[PDB]
Write an enzyme that holds these catalytic residues in place. Structure first.
Site, PDB file in Angstrom:
ATOM      1  N   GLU A   1       0.918  -1.252   0.147  1.00  0.00           N
ATOM      2  CA  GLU A   1      -0.045   0.073  -0.093  1.00  0.00           C
ATOM      3  C   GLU A   1       1.006   1.180   0.062  1.00  0.00           C
ATOM      4  O   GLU A   1       0.293   2.199  -0.518  1.00  0.00           O
ATOM      5  CB  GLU A   1      -0.915  -0.012   1.391  1.00  0.00           C
ATOM      6  CG  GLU A   1      -1.716  -1.167   1.328  1.00  0.00           C
ATOM      7  CD  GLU A   1      -2.763  -1.437   0.468  1.00  0.00           C
ATOM      8  OE1 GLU A   1      -3.073  -0.713  -0.598  1.00  0.00           O
ATOM      9  OE2 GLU A   1      -3.504  -2.401   0.332  1.00  0.00           O
TER      10      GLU A   1
ATOM     11  N   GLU B   1      -4.182   4.843  -1.445  1.00  0.00           N
ATOM     12  CA  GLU B   1      -3.139   3.811  -0.828  1.00  0.00           C
ATOM     13  C   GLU B   1      -2.460   4.426   0.199  1.00  0.00           C
ATOM     14  O   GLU B   1      -1.899   4.086   1.036  1.00  0.00           O
ATOM     15  CB  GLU B   1      -1.936   3.771  -2.072  1.00  0.00           C
ATOM     16  CG  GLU B   1      -2.443   3.383  -3.308  1.00  0.00           C
ATOM     17  CD  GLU B   1      -2.899   1.728  -3.338  1.00  0.00           C
ATOM     18  OE1 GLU B   1      -3.091   1.420  -4.334  1.00  0.00           O
ATOM     19  OE2 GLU B   1      -3.266   1.307  -2.167  1.00  0.00           O
TER      20      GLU B   1
ATOM     21  N   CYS C   1      -4.017  -0.839   6.896  1.00  0.00           N
ATOM     22  CA  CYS C   1      -3.117  -2.075   7.635  1.00  0.00           C
ATOM     23  C   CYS C   1      -2.661  -1.650   8.759  1.00  0.00           C
ATOM     24  O   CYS C   1      -2.502  -2.679   9.612  1.00  0.00           O
ATOM     25  CB  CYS C   1      -2.199  -2.392   6.487  1.00  0.00           C
ATOM     26  SG  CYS C   1      -2.689  -3.220   4.958  1.00  0.00           S
TER      27      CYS C   1
HETATM   28 FE    FE Z   1      -4.204  -0.396  -1.829  1.00  0.00          FE
END
Ligand code: FE
Ligand code: FE
Ligand code: FE
Lengths: 168, 515, 136, 390, 390, 75, 136
Positions: F38, F68, F75
């Site tokens: 990402e 992103e 995440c």
């Molecule tokens: Fe992504």
């Protein structure tokens, strides 16, 4: 008794036929005052149409209010009762009567009868609400004084009930 | 000047604006409440939560986003809506829609209090409450809306704003949480709504219920109800500020304890039996005995921390408390008898206590098995659950002399021959109308104030009509037009229809005709 | 401390033993209490406040605090007063946190509760009667 | 541990989940999943706004539109009902007919206002970093803005308080929502004016943001004499809840309020270099147009055309309008004296400019409200009556 | 049914939940629960902004500050590293030092802009209902606003595009966030100007909101000749990512941009009765001050005082400033010709007014940026150089 | 919606410690390894925004650049 | 229809039977497919769209649609194209719902997907190559 359905029945249909025959403000005023003396409050003359009187009352108010707007001059709608009395004068009169009451039983009867006679559309809304509020203030101060003083046995005799059963 | 100025970044925080609020009001001779009242609220009262309009919205929107994420995203993806024990998913039909009318009527009550107060800050606390109760109306609605979409029986979750009108339990709820909030001296209404209803009874009704909900598989109700109560605590403070604002008024010494005792009895009369009934009989898994819940929240904590502490200012322990304690022990079991006996007039499906429920009842309320449990087990044997039985227990009560009366004041049903809670039947005739009253506190209310208490009861309205016709006219059926919403069991088969009810021949009597 | 347990005193009795005490004449009037009860709704932010504010510094300043797990919420009862500084909660959480954000998950108060500055207080005191409310 | 049981959750405890799963039927017991499916939809399909709002008010069949039956359980001493037909002169076949065209239930309402709350603070912190205050005429700043704009908060605060009895007395749930949101927006306007003044005080040493001077002006300066008198009457002089809404929003606030907020304080900010005040009047004017959509639905679309009471209701609406429009014209005639205190700018603060602004307010009002209820008004006549005080 | 298994959830299935519960230990296996507890906090305690951002960039120890080791796994043909020291002239002991003072990770950034998105549409719908466009000078409207404000969107669009290589090339995660958010705000400004123009076209028949005329003006009108040349250079003429950020935001946008947006289009809207444009410039100026807080941290607070490279970095910053300030002064000298097209208003569009506005821009810039990196500038000298084109 | 589910509903349910240990260990690797993808996709999308000549094509890459960042933080 | 099942064709084989087909020479190059795959994340709004749009009118216009329950998401595969009108979803839900709100819970597309007006389309067609993209 065997009740008819709640919202649509022969009692309501019959009274709507009477009401449709009211044609003048004076006639409608007499009609609604008689109706309210006859059929509303715990001092009503009859409980025969107890479950229908409130709907019927609404229909009389509707007829009286429309007749008012079709037949009276605009200024009358603001400043007069449909009896022809001055609205401000009705106000001062009934506040005076209740402030001269000596008991809660006299005060309570004045307030109830005032509403029986002058509830809108008989009196203008603004004048009526303000008077009703001043009457209720007095009635409550009287009744709520020494509220737990009289025992139930005495209250029952003061009120005038026929005691039909007391469980042991 | 036009070239120099301080350029540090500054804003204006909510408490900086709030400090000026008291000075927004201004003096004129017509500036007084429109509503009847024995009291005068002091001009200088301050409020405990310093809230302005922009920060109000900011704070409430942040609560909503978390609540609606949990509901529309996480719990929906988990399928939580149909992971609830049937007894509880039925109970929530009644809890959320009945509570809804209290939230709704509290909007109008808070507005009447905003009118009553003279201090701008005090008006502002009530105003925040007015907006909150709109929130809560929509939140209770959202619960039943969510259940309509996701639970296995949407009937009654989907139409209670009309199907509640069929039955007798709804009338008592309108007294405590609708007319009690808005019809009276503004201060009597305030004690009914804020000091008792909200500061006392929503702790069990809205907070403590979430543990029962979770025990029975319902994580929808905790998500919403715990958020509802975050606002409610600000309303508890409103009720206390009412008392503060009339503390130096000589009328309070004359009147306040009478208004408080009337309101305390009014609220307890319905919630003490009805919450205990919905918690203990409308659940499979039980958290604790209702009488312990009441003891903790009502008697010890609200009683000690609110009423007990106000002792130094003239507030007395309510005279009706001793009667209330007896109700907390037995009156919800008395109400169960009436609720189960008149099951076809409701809008939820019920379950008789099973063998393990009965063991728990007898352990926590010794004597239950010999009085209530014997009756439930007889009804079961007579075919209470079976639509071919022809058996409706309201008829059985009448056959055995166990008449049901409706209190003219509280609308709570009463079965004097079977009841173990507080009260006794008084039947009066007054001006050609018979009235049944059931306890000392409400009898006095009616004797002193008969034009306040003229409420038609279900026997007066349905006299002589057959049960199934009343249910059909009230729309108390499912979408096929013939299966009742209400059921005497929670199984998915053998549901009762209008023709099964009609076969029992049940006609409403006039209970006071024998007197 | 153990006087503030949810199941304190009469609540430990069952059956007839409970009934006898509940109906005793001494228990037919309210008894004034100096306790406060705070209910906090479970959430990520609240569970950190419970562990690192209420049960560490809070209980150090007020050893009478009892916290009980009621599944969906925390039930807290203490003698006298409980105080929570939103400024300290924000440092712990690492994000902006005013007194109004703390109120997102404060679910009930049995007590006099109010906001002043960054601080939320629930107290036995009769605020506005025995002790005045102030501005900032 | 702890004194009480730790309750096992029915969703996740394996024993309790297994018992629950065995009790849930394998089929639905009904197929109707639309919540309050019997509400009559105003638009093509039922909206969530209608579903969550409509029939929360437990009216009986003797209040037009109600689904319940029987008397209230507890009434006022004397007999006044919890709600009743005696609360207003107007009549209708169904009090639940009204819909807010913006469909605001509680959540969209606070969501939107929360965006304005947080954006306002970001804007103020940047505006102070920009130093854009340096460019505002200091006479407009300390003389008109601080004192006369400050005083206008009392007009908004009085309109707010006029809603207290409306919130108690009105007869349906969609009406009550409309009224309460309108009330909060008016008190928000009052608090935003004081927020502006407090903000300026942080930037300009010796700017006095106390309300003392604004309150003196509101109560005693003849510029506000007619405004204050109309607001005291609308708030405390009447209790008909339809009269209060109509008088407050559709006459007084639509004429005096729109002139004072838009034609005077917002428009003249953009001739004396005030880049701050139009940020705040952008909110009040947005709140005015959202409130107008709802007041229009209730009075103009519904009550003035009720199939049985429309002409009846227009009789009262026309009488009310005649009375409060006169009050409002008086209020404006006192107000335009303020122009004697400001710099004469052609097409803005000269007689021609004030006359075109008054023509905008009254001409708009005639189209928005007057024509639609049958009320005859001569715009030029009203403009001339106000210019008498110029 | 369906072709594939319906997977049982471990959270709620009784069998799987029972198995999971028997595998989970009854105690924690470590007590350190602060995510990336080893980050050095800029403020009193670690913030969520730092926790979620800091060291996401997998730099090795040969890029100052990195925690990893070894070469990149795949490089450009020829050997150019994925990231490298050859991307900029500036140097530092730790590229991860920068903190945005507003602490924006992705969620607060879109939360805030979403509030502005939705509020803008409510404001536009009310503004059109208000008819407040009636009060705007139609020459300012169709001549200055439509054409010259329209053309300014190309300056914002070019500053936006200057960030593409910055987003690829820069050397840490907090820097990359700052740069990308700055870029989106600049393209947002360009889209908001075109939104204003499209909005006016719905209200004024025959208003042409096409970009053709604005684009002709931007590319060929001498009023924009120096602006366009500086923007083409900043965007496509260099690749040092620190040069682009510094030149774009701290010199060109802080001088020409602030003059054009605030001193010209926003300030003069509030003398020709434009109540619409200041709603839009309120956003661009707010975005300018938020971006400035971050650019200041990176260049003024950190790189200009790096304990080992501060003087080294100021050598480049001073050279860059000398070059782009000259470009920007030229751009302003071309721009102030626009004042020949507008009504002369004392203290606003006369030579005295323009000279006080230029004194505000350059004097602010000297305090905000020039003094802080050691750059000597004579404000009066720069004001006189711009007035040459008046 | 995502943060409501996490910070309100799943936290109140205790979901964070109702995961099989093997999987709660695997998520150490899955979420942090995916994180770098990402993160680096931010810079890659920006390089593509540079490459393209059509404003619309630059705009698709630009939306990806912002996404992103979102995913890194997720995440 | 059954060609669009998640477990269609080779996916029903196990053990050695699967291996023999998976390694067959015909399956060592891609085979062009006219299918689209749509993944929708489970949520209140999505589950209503699935039941009252995709599985009623959607399947009436495209009988090849297969929907499978993958616990946290719906897996949808169809021949040709799938289209969802956000305007129709809003009427069903009773709340404002633009094409961008529909995208809140659209989780994956194997296909050419685009937004035009209120409509979201996922199609086998090579948009911008065989058929141009338009403005409103
Ligand atoms: Fe992504
Ligand atoms: Fe509430
Ligand atoms: Fe409340």
């Amino acid at each position: 008794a065997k009740r008819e359905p709640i919202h649509d029945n022969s009692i309501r249909t019959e009274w709507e036929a009477k009401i449709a025959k009211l044609t003048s403000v004076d006639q409608a005023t007499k009609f609604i005052q008689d109706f309210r003396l006859a059929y509303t409050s715990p001092f009503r003359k009859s409980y025969d149409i107890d479950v229908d009187y409130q709907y019927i009352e609404r229909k009389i108010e509707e007829k009286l209010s429309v007749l008012k707007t079709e037949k009276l001059p605009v200024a009358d709608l603001i400043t007069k009762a449909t009896t022809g009395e001055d609205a401000a004068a009705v106000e001062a009169t009934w506040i005076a009567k209740i402030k001269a009451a000596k008991s809660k039983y006299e005060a309570e009867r004045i307030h109830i009868e005032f509403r029986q006679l002058y509830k809108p559309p008989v009196l203008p809304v603004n004048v009526f609400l303000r008077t009703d509020a001043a009457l209720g203030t007095v009635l409550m101060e009287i009744r709520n004084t020494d509220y737990y003083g009289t025992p139930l046995e005495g209250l029952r005799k003061e009120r005038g009930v026929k005691v039909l059963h007391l469980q042991a | 000047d036009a070239l120099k100025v301080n350029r540090a970044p500054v804003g204006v925080e909510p408490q900086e604006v709030h400090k000026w609020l008291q000075s927004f009001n201004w003096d004129f001779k017509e500036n007084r409440t429109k509503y009847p009242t024995k009291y005068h609220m002091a001009n200088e009262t301050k409020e405990q939560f310093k809230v302005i309009a922009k920060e109000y919205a900011r704070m409430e929107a942040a609560k909503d986003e978390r609540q609606f994420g949990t509901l529309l995203d996480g719990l929906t993806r988990l399928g939580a809506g149909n992971k609830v024990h049937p007894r509880w998913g039925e109970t929530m039909k009644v809890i959320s829609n009945f509570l809804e009318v209290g939230e709704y009527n509290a909007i109008a009550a808070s507005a009447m209090l905003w009118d009553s107060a003279t201090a701008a800050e005090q008006k502002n606390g009530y105003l925040a409450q007015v907006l909150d109760e709109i929130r809560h109306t929509h939140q209770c609605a959202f619960i039943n809306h969510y259940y309509s979409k996701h639970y296995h029986d949407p009937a009654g979750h989907n139409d209670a704003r009309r199907t509640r009108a069929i039955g007798p339990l709804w009338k008592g709820m309108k007294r405590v949480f609708a007319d009690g909030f808005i019809s009276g001296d503004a201060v009597e209404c305030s004690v009914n709504l804020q000091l008792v209803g909200e500061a006392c009874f929503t702790n069990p009704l809205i907070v403590a219920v979430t543990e029962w909900a979770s025990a029975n598989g319902d994580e929808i109700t905790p998500t919403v109800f715990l958020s509802v109560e975050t606002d409610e605590l600000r309303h508890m403070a409103n009720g206390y500020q009412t008392v503060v604002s009339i503390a130096n008024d000589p009328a309070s010494a004359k009147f306040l304890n009478t208004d408080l005792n009337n309101a305390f009895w009014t609220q307890q009369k319905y919630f003490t039996p009805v919450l205990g009934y919905l918690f203990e009989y409308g659940s499979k898994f039980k958290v604790e005995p209702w009488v312990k819940t009441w003891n903790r929240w009502v008697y010890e904590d609200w009683g000690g921390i609110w009423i007990g502490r106000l002792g130094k200012y003239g507030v007395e322990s309510p005279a009706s408390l001793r009667d209330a304690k007896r109700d907390a022990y037995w009156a919800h079991h008395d109400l169960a008898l009436a609720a189960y006996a008149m099951w076809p007039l409701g809008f939820a499906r019920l379950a008789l206590p099973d063998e393990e429920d009965q063991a728990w009842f007898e352990a926590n309320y010794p004597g239950w098995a010999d009085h209530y449990g014997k009756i439930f087990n007889e009804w079961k044997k007579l075919g209470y659950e079976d639509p071919k039985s022809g058996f409706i227990p309201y008829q059985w009560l009448l056959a055995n002399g166990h008449d049901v009366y409706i209190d003219r004041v509280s609308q709570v049903p009463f079965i004097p021959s079977l009841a173990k809670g507080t009260g006794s039947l008084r039947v009066h005739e007054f001006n050609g109308k018979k009235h049944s009253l059931t306890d000392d506190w409400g009898e006095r209310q009616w004797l002193i104030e008969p034009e306040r208490y003229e409420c038609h009861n279900v026997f007066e309205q349905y006299e002589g009509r057959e049960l199934s016709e009343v249910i059909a006219e009230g729309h108390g059926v499912r979408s096929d037009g013939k299966t009742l919403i209400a059921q005497p069991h929670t199984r998915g088969d053998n549901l009762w229809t209008l023709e099964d009810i009609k076969r029992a021949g049940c006609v409403f009597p006039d209970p006071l005709a024998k007197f | 401390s153990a006087h503030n347990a949810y199941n304190a005193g009469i609540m430990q009795k069952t059956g007839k033993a409970f009934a006898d005490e509940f109906f005793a004449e001494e228990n037919q009037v309210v008894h004034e209490s100096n306790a406060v009860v705070l209910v906090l709704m479970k959430s990520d932010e609240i569970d950190a406040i419970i562990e690192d504010i209420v049960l560490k510094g809070g209980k150090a300043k007020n050893p009478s605090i009892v916290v009980e797990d009621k599944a969906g919420f925390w039930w807290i009862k203490a003698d006298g007063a409980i105080e929570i500084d939103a400024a300290e909660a924000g440092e712990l959480l690492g994000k902006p946190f005013s007194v109004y954000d703390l109120l997102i998950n404060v679910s009930s108060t049995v007590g006099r509760a109010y906001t002043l500055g960054t601080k939320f207080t629930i107290t036995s005191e009769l605020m506005g009667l025995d002790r005045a409310l102030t501005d900032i | 541990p702890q004194s009480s049981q730790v309750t096992k959750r029915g969703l996740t405890d394996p024993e309790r989940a297994a018992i629950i799963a065995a009790a849930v039927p394998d089929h639905a017991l009904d197929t109707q999943r639309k919540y309050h499916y019997f509400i009559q939809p105003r638009w093509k399909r039922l909206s969530e706004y209608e579903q969550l709002s409509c029939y929360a008010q437990p009216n009986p069949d003797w209040i037009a539109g109600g689904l319940d039956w029987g008397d209230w359980t507890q009434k006022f001493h004397g007999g006044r009902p919890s709600w009743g037909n005696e609360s207003t002169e107007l009549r209708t076949t169904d009090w639940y007919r009204h819909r807010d065209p913006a469909r605001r239930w509680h959540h969209p309402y606070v969501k939107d206002k929360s965006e304005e709350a947080r954006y306002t603070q970001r804007f103020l912190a940047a505006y102070s970093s920009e130093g854009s205050i340096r460019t505002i005429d200091p006479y407009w700043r300390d003389e008109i803005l601080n004192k006369y704009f400050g005083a206008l908060l009392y007009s908004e605060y009085g309109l707010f308080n006029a809603h207290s009895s409306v919130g108690r007395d009105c007869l349906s749930d969609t009406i009550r929502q409309t009224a309460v949101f309108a009330a909060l927006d008016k008190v928000d306007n009052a608090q935003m004016i004081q927020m502006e003044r407090l903000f300026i005080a942080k930037l300009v040493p010796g700017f006095d943001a106390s309300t003392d001077v604004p309150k003196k002006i509101w109560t005693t300066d003849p510029i506000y004499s007619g405004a204050r008198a109309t607001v005291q009457e609308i708030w405390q002089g009447v209790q008909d809840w339809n009269e209060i809404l109509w008088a407050g929003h559709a006459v007084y606030d639509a004429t005096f309020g729109q002139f004072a907020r838009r034609e005077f304080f917002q428009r003249l900010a953009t001739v004396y270099g005030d880049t701050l005040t139009p940020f705040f009047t952008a909110q009040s004017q947005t709140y005015f147009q959202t409130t107008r959509g709802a007041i229009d639905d209730l009075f103009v679309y519904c009550l003035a055309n009720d199939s049985e009471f429309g002409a009846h209701n227009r009789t009262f609406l026309n009488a009310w309008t005649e009375h409060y429009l006169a009050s409002s014209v008086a209020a404006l005639k006192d107000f335009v004296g303020l122009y004697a205190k400001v710099e004469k700018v052609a097409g803005a603060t000269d007689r021609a400019g004030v006359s075109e602004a008054l023509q905008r307010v009254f001409g708009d009002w005639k189209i928005d409200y007057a024509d639609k209820i049958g009320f005859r008004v001569d715009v030029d006549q009203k403009v001339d009556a106000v210019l008498a005080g110029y």
